[PDB]
Design a protein around this ligand. Structure first.
Ligand SMILES: [Mg+2]
Ligand SMILES: [Mg+2]
Ligand SMILES: [Mg+2]
Ligand SMILES: [Mg+2]
Ligand SMILES: [Mg+2]
Ligand SMILES: [Mg+2]
Ligand SMILES: [Mg+2]
Lengths: 247, 190, 138, 201, 175, 109
RNA sequence: CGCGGAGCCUCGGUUGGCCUCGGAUAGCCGGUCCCCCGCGGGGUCCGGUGCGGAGUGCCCUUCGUCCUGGGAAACGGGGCGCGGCCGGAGAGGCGGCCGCCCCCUCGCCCGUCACGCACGCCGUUCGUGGGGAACCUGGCGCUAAACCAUUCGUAGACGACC
RNA sequence: CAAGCGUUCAUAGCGACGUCGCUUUUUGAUCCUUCGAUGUCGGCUCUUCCUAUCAUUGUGAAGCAGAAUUCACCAAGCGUUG
């Protein structure tokens, strides 16, 4: 028979391989469509949630009850030290998808950036990127990374920039910097590219990516809560008091 | 029953020059040039007439429902000649009871702006097809003139604004408001 | 646009069937798919024949619409179909398909040697004309 | 026949080609259908789009991820139709499906090989001219394909590069026919014995 | 009854002689069938519908083929008919333009099958009759029917589609 | 120093739908697609040829790695130019979709 | 990377074809005298082909060896022959184009002889320096991380994770 | 199908006398399955599906002026309670 009194369903299926996330730093699943007329900029950044607080501000939305009144707004504060660019990566468009061409890291790298390369550090010898850095001063300092930028100039379409956090400026106990590819939504590859070739080994502060009162998106990982019952997870009803095997 | 042959000849006048690329006719006269493919209709376009006098379409071993396609090509071509010699001119008049329909064109044609239909706030914008030059008329009060060469481009732009001005949730037997095609004519009459 | 019309007097090469590889003059049209056909001198008795099995040439001759095997013997004798065909290229790529299938294993060897030398004298020239088209480029 | 086959899917009929491919895969021959976006199906477009959407509504209710996998790219659409004509439940059936290789657009090494046609599957032959029909490229797009645009911009870049190859090959034959005539008395008794046995007439 | 290519097996036959009437009349019918054995049997089907005569109380006198007197000359055949549709039974006249009476009703049997889904056991041929140029009503036949007849063969599909099953050249259809 | 064995593929054994008879095998000789075309190969010897991991003697030679099942063509099969052939042992179903070699030598020209 | 010697094993194969676009009641190629565009592309004219002969009914290349001693053909080919410049990215995996050394003289007709001629008999003939697994020479380079243990909680039923 | 109702007007909306069907959310008929037992009413909870659409999107009809309202079409997206 049918349901006597209809009711909505509990919890959207549009979310529901509801598993412990496989990554930790929030991965951007889609970058904005790059209009190739506006200047070059970064589309993403990497901050740290700190806490919250009250704000007091004046409102301007004429016709509302709270026009020219003072409200309080709860605000988070995302501590966001300047990020450092280390490498650039090229992507080329295929029928089968969107493949990656050529990653080219800078001459120096960092110390915090090395952390993100090995699980156990103090046991290792810290050898990562010790011969790739050798390419950046010799004859082959023109083959593998000057014919490469010309290759990424000919056949590439989308160019992201690998950039890592500075973990040493934060109060945190962590030192493993966080790398992330931040697509460059500029115009005209080879201008999209002869801008990040410049900013290698360079700082990028938040006022370059973002401006005041700009609508952004926040991409992180939910707070963890462990194994949970059907009542907490999917927010179902509780059965009545008398139910023999659990309510 | 398959009919062995049907055909029809078009009388091309002396102003025009028609020259067919196999099945795609191109028509150029005083006003401009028009083109139309027919690589869906499977007929034989001959240019038998000399100096240039006849576009003759055959069909061939075809049955009832394709023999009908013979004349519809014939007419699509004369309409092409009548459009490049004289040019089409669709006239449309604005009708209303109380709120005056307020038309103003905005680029050359290409943007017909309609205010105050039935008092509505929402301003209706209507593109034109390429090559259609919409223009607000004179010697009449509420009247637009759509000009151009392609009957197909002009008359659907007319419908584009005739269909944009429709009333909703009323008795359109009483509310006879809108801009209606009033006269399908030509630019030069000769 | 067409240039070969099934007519009263069009000569047709018979593609396949019992009379394959002969010529024939279309005497009359019976229906949408069958023609009363006659090859007098190519040894084809007057009979019906589907169009789906005949491909029609560029020749015409001028007998009337139901003539009787003696007037189509003329107008095929004079105007000389049987020697104007065999001057077509059609009749020369026919009688080349014939001559590969009618080729001994010995012949197949002579051409293996002849063509190997032919292909080389023509190859040294092409290498020489490119030498001249590159020197003209200079 | 023998070695690796290359079939250019354009102008072909989805099932008509898939029936001939699947018999030749089962005979051990290696088939590579290419340009499957040019493959077309008989019957007007909406007839086929509606017919495909009925396929999408077929999905295991209690859990879809196990359920029928409605691929969207034209190759996989076509590969599916070949798989429907092989005994893929057995060992010789799966062993066959590996001799097949289907592509959307026309990629490397196969783009630089002469590719053939199956007239018994070709559209201009099996279909009547007065009938409507759909392209598996368009059909895939409105069903959820993502790369109609890319596979078009890529093949326009290859159609421009192969036009160069032909124009040069067209020019080499211009030297051959001109060199054949510029040296034609020391190959005279050779071209003789070629045309007596039907070669070169 | 079934088909093949039909033939004109004409038959005559009398009701074998009783003591009362010693010289019964003879009846020739133009039965129209694929061989002897059924041409004999279609006779008794039609004489039992007209005379009070049966295969037991009668005998076939002559069964033999009558074969076309002008087989190299195209002719216009009208042929009157009577079949059995799913509802009732209707009479017809139809025209076919082949060059042998036999083949002309071989065509007709093909059409009642094709245009009316009437099998051979339902059809009855009233009388076939060859006609002159005029007196032809069906414009499907009335159109060839001239002197300067002229077609092209427009969309000439290629058979031989399995001689070479794989080829490089796309075919041609214009000739 | 070439074929001397016209190519052929072993397509299956003579069967109904839900039966199968393993004595007779179906060869698809290459380049012959008419039951009129195939009266040349009647009577010819064929040869499944394969190798497996152990040395086996060889007339006019040393122990090789090659063995053969050893057959003979009987008659045509269907309009399409297939050929029914029965080998001395029955073919191993591994050769389905592989090479066998119809030779020329029991020739009848 | 080069080039060396044996030994299990897993097998299929037993000349290649190095490419336009597409039209189908139309195409293909020439040649452009002429015109426009970026040696080419587009156009117009004309001239040839079109049951396609610059045709996958196709084309390419040979399949016993060597001798030497005439003719026709004459700088071709090679020594994992060696350096440099290209072109190609869709999953590139391939070519292409230039210098120098040494060596060879080879496709077609002919003469001239020879090569275990194993005595009528079967898996012959190759892609094969195959694919994979174990071991004997030279030159150049190399110089770890992972997991546990510990610790941390941004994570936890344990695992896992930061 | 259509005699009629609908001021007039068969068919806006209806529709007698008749007649053709679908449906298994009614009850029956029947006894094929289960009597070495398939737990045999409701309610609670929860999911999913159908459309013979009550609302909402888009529409055509009206004996639709507006308002309100019936009739019908694509439509099961999301609703349908205390
Ligand atoms: Mg409900
Ligand atoms: Mg209890
Ligand atoms: Mg209202
Ligand atoms: Mg072997
Ligand atoms: Mg009344
Ligand atoms: Mg129980
Ligand atoms: Mg409905």
């Amino acid at each position: 028979s049918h349901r006597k009194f209809s009711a909505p369903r509990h919890g959207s299926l549009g979310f529901l391989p509801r598993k412990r996330s496989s990554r930790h730093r929030g991965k951007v699943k889609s970058f904005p469509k790059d209009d190739s007329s506006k200047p070059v900029h970064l589309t993403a950044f990497l901050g740290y949630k700190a806490g919250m607080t009250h704000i007091v501000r004046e409102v301007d939305r004429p016709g509302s009850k709270v026009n020219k009144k003072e409200v309080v707004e709860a605000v988070t504060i995302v501590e966001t030290p300047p990020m450092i660019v280390v490498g650039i990566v090229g992507y080329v468009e295929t029928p089968r998808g969107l493949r990656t061409f050529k990653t080219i890291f800078a001459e120096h790298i960092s110390d915090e950036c090395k952390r993100r390369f090995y699980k156990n550090w103090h046991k290792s010898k810290k050898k990562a990127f010790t011969k790739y850095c050798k390419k950046w001063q010799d004859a082959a300092g023109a083959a593998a990374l000057a014919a490469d930028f010309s290759s990424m100039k000919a056949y590439c379409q989308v160019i992201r920039v690998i950039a890592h956090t500075q973990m040493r400026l934060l109060p945190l106990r962590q030192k493993k910097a966080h790398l992330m590819e931040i697509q460059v939504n500029g115009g005209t590859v080879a201008e999209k590219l002869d801008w990040a070739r410049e900013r290698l080994e360079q700082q990028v502060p938040v006022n370059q990516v973002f401006g005041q009162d700009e609508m952004i998106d926040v991409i992180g990982v939910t707070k963890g809560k462990g194994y949970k019952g059907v009542t907490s997870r999917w927010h179902t009803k509780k059965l009545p008091r008398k139910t023999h095997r659990g309510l | 029953m398959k009919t062995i042959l049907s055909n029809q000849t078009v009388d091309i006048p002396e102003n025009v020059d028609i020259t067919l690329k196999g099945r795609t006719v191109i028509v150029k006269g005083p006003r401009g040039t028009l083109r139309r493919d027919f690589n869906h209709i499977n007929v034989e376009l001959s240019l038998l007439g000399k100096k240039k006098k006849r576009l003759r379409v055959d069909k061939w071993w075809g049955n009832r429902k394709e023999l009908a396609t013979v004349r519809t090509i014939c007419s699509h071509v004369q309409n092409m000649i009548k459009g490049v010699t004289l040019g089409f001119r669709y006239k449309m008049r604005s009708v209303y009871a109380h709120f005056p329909i307020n038309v103003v064109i905005q680029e050359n044609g290409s943007l017909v702006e309609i205010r105050n239909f039935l008092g509505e706030k929402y301003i209706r914008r209507v593109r034109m097809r390429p090559g259609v030059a919409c223009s607000v008329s004179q010697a009449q009060k509420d009247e637009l003139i759509l000009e151009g060469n392609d009957i197909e481009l002009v008359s659907n732009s007319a419908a584009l604004i005739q269909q944009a001005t429709t009333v909703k949730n009323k008795d359109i037997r009483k509310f006879l408001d809108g801009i209606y095609v009033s006269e399908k004519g030509t630019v030069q009459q000769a | 646009v067409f240039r070969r019309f099934v007519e009263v007097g069009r000569v047709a090469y018979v593609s396949f069937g019992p009379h394959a590889g002969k010529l024939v003059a279309i005497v009359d049209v019976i229906d949408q798919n069958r023609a009363l056909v006659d090859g007098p001198c190519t040894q084809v008795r007057r009979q019906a024949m589907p169009f789906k099995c005949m491909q029609l040439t560029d020749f015409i001759l001028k007998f009337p619409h139901s003539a009787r095997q003696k007037y189509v013997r003329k107008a095929w004798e004079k105007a000389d179909i049987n020697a104007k065909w065999a001057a077509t290229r059609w009749a020369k790529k026919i009688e080349a398909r014939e001559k590969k299938a009618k080729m001994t294993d010995f012949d197949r060897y002579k051409v293996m040697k002849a063509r190997k030398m032919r292909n080389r004298l023509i190859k040294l020239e092409v290498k020489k004309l490119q030498k001249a088209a590159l020197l003209k480029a200079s | 026949e023998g070695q690796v086959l290359v079939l250019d899917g354009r102008g072909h009929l989805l099932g008509r080609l898939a029936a001939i491919v699947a018999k030749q895969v089962l005979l051990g021959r290696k088939v590579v259908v290419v340009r499957c976006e040019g493959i077309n199906i008989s019957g007007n477009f909406y007839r086929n789009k509606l017919k495909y959407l009925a396929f999408l509504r077929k999905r295991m209710n209690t859990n879809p991820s196990r359920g029928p996998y409605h691929f969207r790219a034209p190759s996989r659409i076509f590969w599916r139709t070949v798989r429907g004509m092989l005994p893929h439940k057995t060992k010789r059936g799966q062993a066959a499906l590996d001799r097949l290789k289907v592509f959307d657009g026309i990629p490397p090494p196969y783009d630089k090989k002469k590719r053939m046609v199956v007239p018994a599957a070709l559209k201009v032959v099996r279909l009547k001219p007065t009938r409507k029909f759909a392209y598996l490229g368009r059909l895939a797009h409105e069903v959820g394909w993502k790369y109609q645009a890319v596979t078009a911009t890529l093949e326009e870049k290859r159609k421009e590069k192969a036009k160069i190859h032909y124009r040069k090959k067209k020019q080499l034959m211009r030297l051959r026919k001109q060199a054949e005539k510029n040296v034609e008395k020391k190959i005279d008794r050779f071209t003789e014995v070629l045309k007596t046995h039907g070669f070169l007439v | 009854k079934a088909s093949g290519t039909l033939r004109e097996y004409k038959v005559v036959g009398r009701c074998l002689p009783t003591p009362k009437c010693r010289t019964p009349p003879l009846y020739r019918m133009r039965i129209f069938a694929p061989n002897h054995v059924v041409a004999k049997s279609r006779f008794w089907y039609f004489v039992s519908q007209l005379k009070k005569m049966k295969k037991s109380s009668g005998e076939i006198v002559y069964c033999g083929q009558v074969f076309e007197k002008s087989p190299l000359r195209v002719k216009n055949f009208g042929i009157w008919l009577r079949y059995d549709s799913r509802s009732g039974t209707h009479n017809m006249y139809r025209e076919y333009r082949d060059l042998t009476t036999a083949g002309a009703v071989t065509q007709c049997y093909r059409d009642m099958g094709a245009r009316h889904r009437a099998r051979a056991h339902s059809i009855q041929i009233m009388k076939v009759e060859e006609i002159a140029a005029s007196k032809c009503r069906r414009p499907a036949v009335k159109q060839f029917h001239d002197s300067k007849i002229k077609f092209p063969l427009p969309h000439r599909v290629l058979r031989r589609q399995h001689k070479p099953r794989f080829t490089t050249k796309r075919p041609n259809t214009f000739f | 120093s070439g074929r001397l064995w016209s190519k052929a593929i072993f397509a299956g054994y003579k069967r109904g739908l839900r039966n199968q008879r393993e004595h007779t095998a179906l060869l698809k000789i290459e380049g012959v697609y008419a039951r009129d075309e195939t009266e040349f190969y009647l009577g010819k010897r064929c040869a499944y040829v394969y190798k497996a991991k152990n040395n086996t003697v060889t007339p006019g030679g040393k122990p090789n790695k090659t063995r053969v099942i050893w057959g003979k063509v009987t008659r045509a099969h269907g309009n399409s130019g297939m050929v029914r052939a029965k080998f001395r042992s029955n073919l191993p179903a591994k050769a389905i979709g592989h090479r066998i070699r119809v030779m020329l030598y029991p020739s009848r020209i």
